[PDB]
Design an enzyme around this catalytic site. Structure first.
Site, PDB file in Angstrom:
ATOM      1  N   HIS A  41       0.817  -1.196   0.000  1.00  0.00           N
ATOM      2  CA  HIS A  41       0.000   0.000   0.000  1.00  0.00           C
ATOM      3  C   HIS A  41       0.864   1.266   0.000  1.00  0.00           C
ATOM      4  CE1 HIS A  41       0.337   0.174   4.495  1.00  0.00           C
ATOM      5  NE2 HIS A  41       0.227   1.478   4.252  1.00  0.00           N
ATOM      6  N   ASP A  84       0.060  -7.612   1.777  1.00  0.00           N
ATOM      7  CA  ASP A  84       0.500  -6.223   1.680  1.00  0.00           C
ATOM      8  C   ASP A  84       2.025  -6.095   1.661  1.00  0.00           C
ATOM      9  OD1 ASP A  84       0.392  -3.454   1.626  1.00  0.00           O
ATOM     10  OD2 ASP A  84      -0.119  -3.230   3.762  1.00  0.00           O
ATOM     11  N   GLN A 177       0.913   5.733  11.498  1.00  0.00           N
ATOM     12  CA  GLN A 177       1.025   6.343  10.185  1.00  0.00           C
ATOM     13  C   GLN A 177       2.446   6.825   9.952  1.00  0.00           C
ATOM     14  OE1 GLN A 177      -1.971   6.210  11.935  1.00  0.00           O
ATOM     15  NE2 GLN A 177      -2.181   4.903  10.122  1.00  0.00           N
ATOM     16  N   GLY A 178       3.015   6.497   8.825  1.00  0.00           N
ATOM     17  CA  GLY A 178       4.362   6.762   8.426  1.00  0.00           C
ATOM     18  C   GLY A 178       5.332   5.633   8.716  1.00  0.00           C
ATOM     19  N   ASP A 179       4.930   4.668   9.515  1.00  0.00           N
ATOM     20  CA  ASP A 179       5.723   3.475   9.788  1.00  0.00           C
ATOM     21  C   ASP A 179       5.467   2.358   8.780  1.00  0.00           C
ATOM     22  OD1 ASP A 179       7.101   4.353  12.140  1.00  0.00           O
ATOM     23  OD2 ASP A 179       5.256   3.978  13.320  1.00  0.00           O
ATOM     24  N   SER A 180       4.416   2.475   7.962  1.00  0.00           N
ATOM     25  CA  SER A 180       4.058   1.416   7.043  1.00  0.00           C
ATOM     26  C   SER A 180       5.256   0.994   6.219  1.00  0.00           C
ATOM     27  CB  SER A 180       2.936   1.820   6.100  1.00  0.00           C
ATOM     28  OG  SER A 180       1.715   1.855   6.794  1.00  0.00           O
TER      29      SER A 180
END
Length: 224
Positions: A41, A84, A177-180
């Site tokens: 993603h 993912d 959020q931002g660690d994905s």
């Protein structure tokens, strides 16, 4: 990372930060000199020219070695939260040495055991909903949550056999959020997953959900 601590130099030597359009975006794992593993993603549906990877630095903005992307391959069964993972090929090869190394991957058929300790790292927000993201890498240690418990939290169909969960029941420690796309490793420092999704961040009774390297190893090996 919520509830984390500062990473030290030489921690996670394979981690990369991934910017998009010059701004923070996600994390990844350097598999070999020309290959990064991230979450699908993070890259699916976006112009590949927007991305840059940085290796060998605690900072996401400066230091280390950078590369643009030559290609992007998402898992052939990627959809939304499921399957993912993506393989990125780098325009500039990145040698190991110093504070750069390559990940060691969980085996095909493996699945993290509930209650075992895992460590996740990244440059994402330090508060659910936070307004600014750290420059330097953070890490947090959380236990694996059984897939059955995670299914009780999210729904039976929502957690697949290509996902695993980790977190603390009372909350407070999680990726965000931002660690994905960045790494979660086991107690042997083997890369077991990539940060994928969850209901908010660090909430009680909603584990973080990770894409399972063990479950998706055949895809990784094909293209790495």
């Amino acid at each position: 990372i919520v509830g984390g601590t500062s990473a030290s130099a030489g921690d996670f030597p394979f981690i990369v930060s991934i910017s998009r359009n010059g701004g923070p975006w996600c994390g990844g794992s350097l598999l070999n000199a020309n290959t990064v593993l991230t979450a699908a993603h993070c890259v699916s549906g976006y112009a590949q020219s927007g991305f840059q990877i940085r290796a060998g630095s605690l900072s996401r903005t400066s230091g280390g070695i950078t590369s643009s992307l030559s290609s992007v391959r998402v898992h052939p069964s990627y959809s939304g939260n499921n399957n993912d993972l993506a393989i990125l090929k780098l325009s500039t090869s990145i040698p190991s040495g110093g504070n750069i190394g390559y990940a060691r991957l969980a085996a095909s058929g493996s699945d993290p055991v509930a209650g075992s300790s895992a460590t996740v790292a990244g440059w994402g927000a330090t508060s659910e909903g936070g307004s600014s993201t750290p420059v330097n890498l953070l890490k947090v240690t959380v236990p694996i949550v059984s897939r059955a418990t995670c299914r009780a939290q999210y729904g039976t169909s929502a957690i697949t056999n290509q996902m695993f969960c980790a977190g603390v029941s009372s909350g407070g420690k999680d990726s965000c959020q931002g660690d994905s796309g960045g790494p979660i490793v086991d107690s042997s420092n083997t890369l077991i997953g990539a940060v994928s999704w969850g209901n908010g961040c660090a909430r009680p009774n909603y584990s973080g959900v990770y894409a399972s390297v063990g479950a998706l190893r055949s895809f990784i090996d094909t293209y790495a």
